[PDB]
């Protein structure tokens, strides 16, 4: 997989993500669809592909989604329904920032939350 | 392929493919290598994939290669390395334009060619 994503277009993914946290479920996060409508938002693209702007945040940008400023309750239910793992300075880092403590399961899997 | 290639690039691909028409033999040009040497030369693109350019040049491009502003030698010499047939029409269209009457075999694979 020879994909070089430019940082200004992993930004512009990052806030596509965010504006429509409050639609995003996880099954619709990881459809070709949804980014296909970051694709055709922006013309004068040389390249796009939704294929491969899927792969590259299924593969390069998912592990991040803990880290960015978006609705704390989306960003945990989408991290639910992918069943990302939360380590413990990922865990850590939402309670500081999000205000928010997450009950996670033994393997890691987000499972619920409460506020402060 | 969910691949939209802008009309820009693609005229930047020809003139890739014109300009190193010195060096192209038929597996070059079919090699990831030689797109991503496109795509190295101009920074600031977001997406940059040499295998999909590689599959959009192969898919979308290829078949009108015979009338493409080129060096008519490489050209001819490309289009019979990778046994792509030649019609009557473009055969007399290379006639006209590049001057050179093009031996085909029974296939329409080119053969040879000689000035006129
Ligand atoms: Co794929
Ligand atoms: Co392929």
Request: glycine share 2%; hydrophobic share 45%.
């Given at each position: 997989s020879d994909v070089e994503i430019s940082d200004s277009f992993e930004k512009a993914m990052w806030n596509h993500v965010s504006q429509n946290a409050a639609r995003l479920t996880g099954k619709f996060l990881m459809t070709e669809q949804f980014w296909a409508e970051l694709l055709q938002?922006?013309?004068?693209?040389?390249i796009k592909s939704a294929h491969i702007v899927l792969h590259h945040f299924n593969e390069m940008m998912l592990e991040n989604l803990?880290?960015?400023?978006?609705?704390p309750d989306a960003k945990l239910q989408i991290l639910k329904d992918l069943s990302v793992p939360l380590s413990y300075h990922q865990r850590k880092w939402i309670l500081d920032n999000d205000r928010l403590d997450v009950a996670l399961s033994?393997?890691?899997?987000?499972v619920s939350w409460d506020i402060v």
């Amino acid at each position: 997989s020879d994909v070089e994503i430019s940082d200004s277009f992993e930004k512009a993914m990052w806030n596509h993500v965010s504006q429509n946290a409050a639609r995003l479920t996880g099954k619709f996060l990881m459809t070709e669809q949804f980014w296909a409508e970051l694709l055709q938002s922006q013309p004068n693209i040389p390249i796009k592909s939704a294929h491969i702007v899927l792969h590259h945040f299924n593969e390069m940008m998912l592990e991040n989604l803990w880290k960015q400023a978006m609705d704390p309750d989306a960003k945990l239910q989408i991290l639910k329904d992918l069943s990302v793992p939360l380590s413990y300075h990922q865990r850590k880092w939402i309670l500081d920032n999000d205000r928010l403590d997450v009950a996670l399961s033994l393997d890691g899997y987000v499972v619920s939350w409460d506020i402060v």
